[PDB]
């Protein structure tokens, strides 16, 4: 059975404050830059549509070095940091991006047509933009955060797939690291598996896979250590509805519709898709630079920073702006020609992590070590190389940051009004 | 360590009331009218888009002349003033300004699109407006606000840059200074130095630079004088979704897509930009013609107004309304003419800033000293020229307006309504 | 010094109800009809964006017969009116109107085009209608409302103004009077006097003078007598973005954008204005049909009716429907004809006013007579012709509505309600 | 003197609970379908923009067999039902129906012109519908509800009405009957006598009169029978602005425009009107299916149900939609024809009402009498024909519904619970 860490972790009255000084992100929105004939990454690529992965790394409070050591006894127990305040500061202003494609699979407008649509060619793609659908997140927990999508299925051997065959779907559960993109209205789904066409979805998500926080999963979760804490808002609605160039995959069943004839008698593709909208972006429904109290956690680990860790991912496409800037070829002409300015795009991300941790302890006894055992061994060989080096996040190294004087931070005076005492 | 206010600062029970008049601006809501061969200004910028700094006059209450002086001792301690209630009076209707570009850099529309567009000549650009993002927001502080944008950043000692190569970004922390634009839907920028298209925005933020105020910043500040109360409400979403036209400075990753042929052979522009809009005002989401009453702050200085100053850092988008007026050349012919008419534009600003200031006693103690020296030396040195000249902001002298009838006066009244006594 | 009323009036214990049976106005939305030889109005200009001033006569308690007497000393003392509460009844169905004119000064559609626009001929004006902003408000004292507009200011004596000049501003207060048309999305100014073009807004403000209240103004006001009582709800988006007409009468400063060449050689009007657009209206959103409870004002004048009078002004825009009926010319032919109808606009009002008055007592003392001689002398002289004959108000004569039943009234039931004893 | 009816009523303990089985109402949504040779209705009008008063008729409780009589003296008093629990059941799922006219007067759409309109010629109406305005509204009261429009005036004896003279207006107060129609975006008017065009508005109230209901009148009312207890909510907002083809029936004063040329030379009817449009519809919204606790009426009359009647009227727009069913002619051809398919339209109302009723007894005093006599002479003439058989409404007999086992019903069982005891 699994028990809450307030029956083993004790609470002692210390509080640190800790935070980094002014993260900042630039890059293209769309994708990376980088040299054709190499493949070394010169500008990355830096959307409001991406995931952000903070690995928060915090001092051994075994090794830390306190004024005072006398409120435990290194002998019996050992020492946890327990995350208790959260403040995820965001700073440029609020505002929308948008991303498109110049060769967009999007046949005919199906909104409203006034005659029965021409006749698919070869390629009709046309160049089209869309505003992502708003999304708004953060979760925070000492394990790394899982996420959903659609991909690609392993097919059952008999029939032979033949060339151009639907593909399978399957629910694929993945590790969400720092820089993967989230859904923007077209679902969560690996598009570069599932599309061969390259054009169903704006360049930015085109060939990457849209992810989705697998909440179910996580709050199931035995131990709760991948998220304590959450916050989500996701908005959208539909701005435009289009038909899909391409050949039928799957004949429309002939017994839903009456055989038309002249024009109406070769039937226009009904496979429809609709292009997102997330609307209007506003302060009063901010989810950031509030701070987030973690006493009660709902999941058995309370707020416990185990291997002094600690995860906080976010999602904020409120400050999606990207700008544009141009710089001119010459300076002289005082006549415009389009060919005389370089138009490019960027977009940045600003952030700033506060948190307030408690210093816990733990009477190592037979029965605790038998459990902190169990849920994960690698707790007790660390006390008295990294595991998942495999994936990638925002390292964050907070091992100088921690600060007794909760008086001195904007997060620490909110928390000590806050506490009172 | 930083301490607050309550701790050397003492709270006598005087209160005064101080207000401007009734503040007016007018002017021309894009651009300066001045005489061409001159450069004295004419008619100046007065655009609800700017900024308003409030640069604040009190009366020394150490020279001030109260009818008693016996709650202190003029030997051991000295007077400030402390502001404690704050009434931004706004005065024209609500409503919904506008600006555009008569060469603004706009392709095609991206929105939606029933064939490929053209082929992008020599410019391209179109006659087009805008209603920017609406902004509502009151900074209060002892010193100026401080600001935030993207700048062209200095290039590194290698690579020389080629014409036309994309200019590197810098956030740029900056004082905002009376008259400065807010973002206005294309982020917080250096347009003049990151786009020398100049037609990339509207005429009005065109060679300007729109700041957004660095609120983490200011918090972040040890002493809090910058800042010590705000209130900020902004809201946009996206009206039009279009191309730019000029060079690709960057070219789409061709593993992003499968090459099209014929028409679809070229690559449109996928240089996307979006076209703000700050939906509709109303009296319900109004923030000023309300008082604010100043009595904890979050920082450490609780509303202190040191050196006699004060700043009061105003945006407010819900009165933007520019109004066209128009005279007749000749008012004979009885047959409309164009010609006959000449167009112009205005926009008027409305303000009444109120206070209400409660008088504050400093003992001159070693420690007090030794704090105040270190924390603003010029304070003392001031007690028994402008440190801002380079910086300008409407100057507001209060100096002859402050009273001790609080009755008189509608804050006043309001002010000992809400404390009862 | 100025002292609330509460200081020198004298709450007696008596109630009476007053109200007005139901007031109509009906007339033509956009102007008045009348004889064309002659100047007297047939039909007058009623619509549901006028100012609504309701000049309030009571009968003048002094001269008023009670059934008893002994309450008060007729030689010491003096009584006066004071209103404690009131409720504006609004009665036809809610609905928005809206208003247009035939020719007005619209050059080209500019919130997005795809070509340049063709070039300014001759009166390039269309005919376009708006729907107004939303207004709701009410406003009530014992002095009448006093509203500012921008209008053409008096020229210094220096340049000789020439022909088609911009004309100074200069913000102008005047008293509001019924009739007067409320700020519609284009502004509180004088159209007449600012916009020789006769074409630049509808027919309807067209030819008057659109004012906001100065409620800034009238609550500094040191008595508060003007208005003791007031809600305020208003509301605007903009629906669409236009070019204006006519000849640049300030050009474009070069040093904001590169010359154009061939099409955008000339540069397109960037005299743009928006179209107004109050949204939905809704009865959760509604200020009238509910009482208002004149307890505690703001100001010092506590809701006394200084000379029997009393002043409601009101504006209401959630009921501006306007119906057309047009009539036959002949019953004859069954086939239409459009010459066989005469198509025709008309607007309907309906209020109802409903008051509950205090009587109340002034002990005649010096002190007493000094302050109210020197606040408003007419007040003494009344006691034991119009001086504001010059403005034109809705009069309404109460002097024989005064009932003592409030039982058998609805505002009267409430109030006894409200007030339990 | 009127006086509440809790004066002279009292109050037993005895409680019963009556209810519809479950009202069906299905037609066409815009006109009654009959024989053309005959004029019996084959098929009614049934739209969810009608009115529907419901006429309840109740059990007479002196002539009703209780299993106990003891509770009174029928001697010397009498019985009355007092409602004090309504619950108005709606059925359908919410949707928005559409309303059109294949002639309306639509000239041009003056929202917006590129060029000046062409020139009406003969009959230039156009097919066109709309989304009348949202309207839900409940009135409950013992008399019929009463309604306010506007119609025809009758003319002033002197200038002889020249024919197409515009007819003169009055504000008329009718009683509101079952299957009226309720103002739906143009007003509430007789559309049939104050427009000969017959095509102004769409078919289903094109020969109707659109009735508000007249709360200000209902509510003077001194007994306030009609009604004593009422909800009602109502919005609209402004989707298309049009012209009226036809002539003018009040030319523009010239004083208001400057004459135009060529094309402006012919001023473009400004006769404009809006296209209505009841936003969204939703659950969160709703006013039924949620009972009403007819405690304390604001009406002298709390919620007696004299002569053992009740009314309730109600208006539900929220569920207007209406279903096309169209049966083919050949069941044979595998070629779609629009010559086999007979299209139709139907709509479908669902009602269920639920009262909860509490007994009441009056013992017949002398001074009761002369009142109930004064106040309504047929009281006491029927205690120890139909008055209205001109109306009509929508008869429901209750006679046989009443139930002391409020427990067995879902409103009896809230009732219950809500009142505790």
């Keep these: 059975a699994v028990v809450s860490t307030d029956e083993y972790v ?68 050992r020492l946890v940091w327990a995350c208790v305040g959260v403040e995820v500061g965001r700073g440029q202003p609020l505002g929308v991006g948008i991303s498109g494609h110049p060769l967009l699979n999007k046949l005919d407008d199906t909104e409203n047509a006034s005659a029965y649509a021409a006749n698919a060619g070869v390629d009709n793609r046309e160049c089209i933009s869309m505003d992502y659908k708003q999304t708004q997140l953060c979760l925070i927990g000492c394990k790394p955060p899982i996420g959903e999508h659609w991909g690609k299925g392993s097919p059952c051997t008999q029939v032979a797939v033949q060339p151009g065959d639907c593909p399978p779907l399957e629910l694929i559960n993945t590790v969400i690291q720092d820089g993967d993109m989230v859904d923007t209205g077209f679902g969560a789904m690996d598009f570069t598996t599932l599309q061969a066409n390259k054009s169903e979805v704006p360049l930015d998500i085109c060939t990457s896979i849209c992810k989705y926080p697998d909440y179910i999963k996580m709050v199931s979760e035995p131990y709760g250590d991948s998220l304590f804490f959450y916050l989500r808002r996701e908005q959208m609605f539909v701005r435009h509805l289009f038909n899909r160039a391409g050949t039928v995959g799957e004949n429309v069943p002939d017994d839903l519709y009456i055989k038309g004839s002249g024009s109406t008698a070769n039937l226009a593709s009904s496979n429809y898709f609709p292009t997102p909208s997330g609307s209007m972006v506003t302060s009063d429904a901010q989810i950031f630079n509030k701070p987030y109290w973690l006493q009660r956690a709902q999941g058995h680990n309370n707020g416990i920073c185990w291997g002094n860790q600690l995860f906080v991912t976010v999602v904020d496409t409120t400050r999606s702006t990207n700008m544009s800037l141009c710089a001119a070829i010459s300076t002289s002409e005082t006549t415009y020609k389009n060919t005389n300015f370089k138009e490019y795009l960027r977009h940045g991300e600003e952030y700033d992590l506060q948190f307030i941790f408690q210093l816990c302890k733990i009477t190592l006894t037979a029965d605790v070590m038998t459990y902190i055992h169990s849920m994960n061994s690698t707790i007790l060989e660390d006390w008295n190389e990294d595991p998942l080096k495999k994936y990638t996040f925002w390292e964050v190294n907070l091992k100088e940051k921690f600060s007794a004087d909760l008086d001195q931070f904007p997060l620490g005076r909110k928390f000590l009004l806050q506490l009172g005492l």
């Design 10 to 77: 004790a609470r002692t009255n210390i509080y640190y404050h800790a935070g980094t000084s002014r993260l900042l992100a630039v890059g293209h929105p769309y994708f990376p830059i980088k040299k054709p004939n190499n493949n070394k990454i010169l500008v990355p690529k830096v959307s409001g549509l991406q995931y952000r992965v903070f690995r928060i790394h915090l001092p051994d409070p075994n090794k830390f070095g306190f004024p005072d050591t006398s409120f435990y006894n290194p002998d019996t127990q």
